[PDB]
Amino acid sequence: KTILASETMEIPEEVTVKVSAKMISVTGPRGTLTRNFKHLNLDFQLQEGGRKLKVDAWFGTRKTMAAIRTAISHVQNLITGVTKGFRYKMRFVYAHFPINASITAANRGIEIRNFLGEKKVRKVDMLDGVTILRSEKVKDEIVLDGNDIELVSRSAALINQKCHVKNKDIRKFLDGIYVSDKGAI
RNA sequence: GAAAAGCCAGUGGCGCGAAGCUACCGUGUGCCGGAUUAUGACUGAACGCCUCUAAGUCAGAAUCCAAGCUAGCAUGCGACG
Numbered sequence: 616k617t618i619l620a621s622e623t624m625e626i627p628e629e630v631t632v633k634v635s636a637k638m639i640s641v642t643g644p645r646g647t648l649t650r651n652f653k654h655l656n657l658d659f660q661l662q663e664g665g666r667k668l669k670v671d672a673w674f675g676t677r678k679t680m681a682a683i684r685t686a687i688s689h690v691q692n693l694i695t696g697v698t699k700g701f702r703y704k705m706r707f708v709y710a711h712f713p714i715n716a717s718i719t720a721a722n723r724g725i726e727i728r729n730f731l732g733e734k735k736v737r738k739v740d741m742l743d744g745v746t747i748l749r750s751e752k753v754k755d756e757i758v759l760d761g762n763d764i765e766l767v768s769r770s771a772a773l774i775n776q777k778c779h780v781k782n783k784d785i786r787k788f789l790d791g792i793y794v795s796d797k798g799a800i
Numbered sequence: 801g802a803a804a805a806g807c808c809a810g811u812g813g814c815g816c817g818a819a820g821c822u823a824c825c826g827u828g829u830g831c832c833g834g835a836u837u838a839u840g841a842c843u844g845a846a847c848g849c850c851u852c853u854a855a856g857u858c859a860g861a862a863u864c865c866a867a868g869c870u871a872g873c874a875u876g877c878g879a880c881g
């Protein structure tokens with residue numbers, strides 16, 4: 616019912632955005648990111664020669680109007696991911712059994728052992744654009760690095776949800792792997 | 801006639817009895833991918849914040865559909881002699 620709902624962002628001078636009808640390819644110093652917003656039913660248009668991305672919803676109801684800022688902050692996340700990158704920190708909480716993590720192959724996955732005294736060995740492989748490394752200036756962290764927030768955060772979530780404590784009081788047996796500093800550096 | 805060999809008693813009766821069938825009373829074997837629910841989540845709005853949800857995604861089960869197993873006159877079809 617609303618004639619025009621538009622939002623706009625700014626593109627820095629280190630990153631090149633190439634939008635192809637909704638197929639957004641972002642290029643930066645760190646690499647390249649890409650995404651289908653081919654489902655959003657919005658209007659993307661670059662102005663000032665690739666320095667301003669301006670998004671329209673014409674006759675958008677409040678639902679489509681809420682869909683706008685998703686696209687704008689998604690492409691913010693791509694811009695920051697491909698200029699600086701995302702780096703999640705993930706601390707080891709263990710009550711009685713030290714849980715012993717070992718990387719898999721050139722930092723593409725982790726292997727958790729001795730969790731809860733269990734003998735099942737926990738194996739998670741990093742998704743495409745994410746790597747892992749054990750923390751060395753911190754006591755017990757694993758630090759994930761990547762250019763894509765979805766890939767970093769999904770890998771973080773796999774590691775988290777693969778160390779749940781079952782059949783026991785989750786209010787007391789707090790063992791697991793949880794994320795502490797989630798910014799982007 | 802008798803020994804020998806039998807035969808009659810609907811299978812005369814008993815001991816054993818191969819073969820064939822057979823028994824959890826004996827033996828051998830029984831199944832590999834993906835979708836997903838309940839739930840837990842990721843990025844992220846509406847609502848400068850938050851948010852598993854609105855758009856988009858994930859993990860997920862004696863579940864589901866295949867894979868496998870059985871029939872395949874489905875008046876179906878292919879190669880060839």
Ligand SMILES: [Mg+2]
Pocket residue numbers: none
């Ligand atoms: Mg016998």
